[PDB]
Amino acid sequence: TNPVTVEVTRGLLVESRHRGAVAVVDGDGKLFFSLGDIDTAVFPRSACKAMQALPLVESGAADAYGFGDKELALACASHNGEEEHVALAASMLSRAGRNVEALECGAHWSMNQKVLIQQARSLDAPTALHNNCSGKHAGFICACCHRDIDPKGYVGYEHPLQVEIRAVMERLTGAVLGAESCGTDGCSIPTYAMPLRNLAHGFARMATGTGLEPLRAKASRRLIEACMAEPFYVAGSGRACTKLMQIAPGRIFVKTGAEGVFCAAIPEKGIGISLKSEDGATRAAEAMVAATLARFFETEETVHAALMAFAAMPMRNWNGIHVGDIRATSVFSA
């Protein structure tokens, strides 16, 4: 069973509790730190978008369509569907001769409340461009068009692009990705459950190049640097991913996934991080990733304090009164 990783307090009592697992692995596969079950297969969901963006870069598509750090960050992004994000996704599809009609991810309203209010006020309905995965899907469509592969059905298990993605993520993680570990993701593409140990190892390899072909090392490093250089484009206004990567500019990589996943890397320390809140709560995964990062910056007061501000947070009610805290437990400092 997984330890209690996060507590939610009200008055003088714990009101709710989150259990979870955490794997921290270096480029060589060495375990630096672990909580709970890092050996049972868990769906990474959107947390592994940077891995799925390798076809876009490695194929030459990114360079052929003139993509910079903003486009690669958006390809790696679970974004808010702000105008900047929608404009860039449309720009990406346009350079490959496509538009919104080529996306197969569907439409949804922003999962940032303030952006949803803006969307609702200016649209009858969101489009597939507003989908948090529209950057990744435009990356997929660009990767296909550059290689004269028909993008139609790019979301399906048997499409050449999804065949390629299974191979790429097996090479990074050492985990086998197949039908028995496969589910359908939010955006209708395959998501493959794998141990947290493997997922963390894979990010440690993307961060360091350890055990990768040089082109894959270079593409991997380029995607990780793009996310850290353009953190707004990975998520957006009011988002943990964006704010966490603004604490130590260029030094911390993070990516949220649906159902309480986080992947992260500290390239200068050669470490990859993956974690799962067992109940699937985003708030627990946010506290956990900040507290896990904090272990590696205990000699930098300002960075440690900033990270602990996410590990342990005041909650305010509708009048803005402090009612309690979300707080990572003492297992992250043991």
Query: Which listed residue (72, 73, 89, 187) binds Zn ion by CB under 5 A?
Result: 187
- Chosen residue from 3, 29, 106, 186 binding Cl ion by CB under 5 A: 186
**Beta-carbon count within 10 A of 120 CB:** 13
Three-class SS of residue 286?
Answer: helix
Residue 213's binding partner among Zn ion, a second copy, Cl ion, none (Cβ under 5 to 8 angstroms by kind) is Cl ion
Residue 214, binding choice from a second copy, Zn ion, Cl ion, none, Cβ under 5 to 8 Å by partner class: none
All residues at 6 or more sequence positions from 109 whose CB lies less than 8 Å from its CB, including other chains: 81, 116, 119, 120, 126, 130
Per DSSP, the residues of 313-333 read: EEEE-TT--EEEEEEE-GGGG
Q: Does 39 bind a second copy (CB under 8 A)?
A: no
Q: Please tell me the distance from the alpha carbon of residue 316 to that of residue 334, in angstroms, as a whole number.
A: 29
Q: Is 144 among the annotated ligand-binding positions? A: no
Binder of residue 152, out of Cl ion, a second copy, Zn ion, none (CB less than 5 to 8 A by kind): none
Q: 3-state class of 86 per DSSP?
A: helix
Q: Give yes or no for residue 317 binding Cl ion (CB under 5 A).
A: yes
Candidates 16-24, 49-57, 64-72, 166-174: pick the segment binding Cl ion (CB under 5 A).
166-174
Segment holding 273, helix H or strand E: strand 271-277
Cβ neighbours of residue 193 closer than 8 Å, sequence gap 6 or more: 41, 42, 43, 44, 181, 183
Q: Binding site annotation covers 185?
A: yes
Q: Which is nearer to a second copy, 107 or 229 (CB)?
A: 107
What is the spatial distance between Cα 252 and Cα 225, in angstroms, rounded to a whole number?
9
Q: Is 76 marked as a binding-site residue?
A: no
Residue 212 contact among Cl ion, a second copy, Zn ion, none, beta carbon within 5 to 8 Å by kind: Cl ion
Rounded least distance, CB 186 to Cl ion, Å:
4
Question: Can you say whether the dihedral through the CA atoms of 199, 70, 108, 162 is positive or negative?
Answer: negative
User: 187 a known binding residue?
Assistant: yes
Binding partner of residue 12 among Zn ion, a second copy, Cl ion, none, CB cut-off 5 to 8 Å per kind: a second copy
Question: Please, are residues 290 and 328 in contact by the beta-carbon 8 Å criterion?
Answer: yes
The answer to the question of whether 148 is labelled as a binding residue is yes
**264 interface partner picked from Zn ion, Cl ion, a second copy, none, CB below 5 to 8 A per type:** none
Identified binder of Zn ion from the candidate list 133, 200, 275, 311, rule CB under 5 A: 133
Binding of a second copy at residue 30 (CB under 8 A)?
A: no
Q: Cα(first)–Cα(last) distance of the chain, in Å? A: 18
Measured distance CA(279)–CA(330) in Å, rounded: 20
Token pair recorded at residue 92 = 């990406």
Torsion sign (Cα): 80, 110, 62, 161: positive
- Residue 301 near a second copy by CB under 8 A: no
What residues make contact with a second copy under the rule CB under 8 A? 1, 8, 10-13, 15-19, 41-43, 104-109, 113, 116-117, 120-121, 131, 180-188, 191, 193, 259-260, 277-281, 284, 317-324
What residues make contact with Zn ion under the rule CB under 5 A? 133, 185, 187
Q: Which residues are annotated as a binding site for Mg(2+)?
A: 148
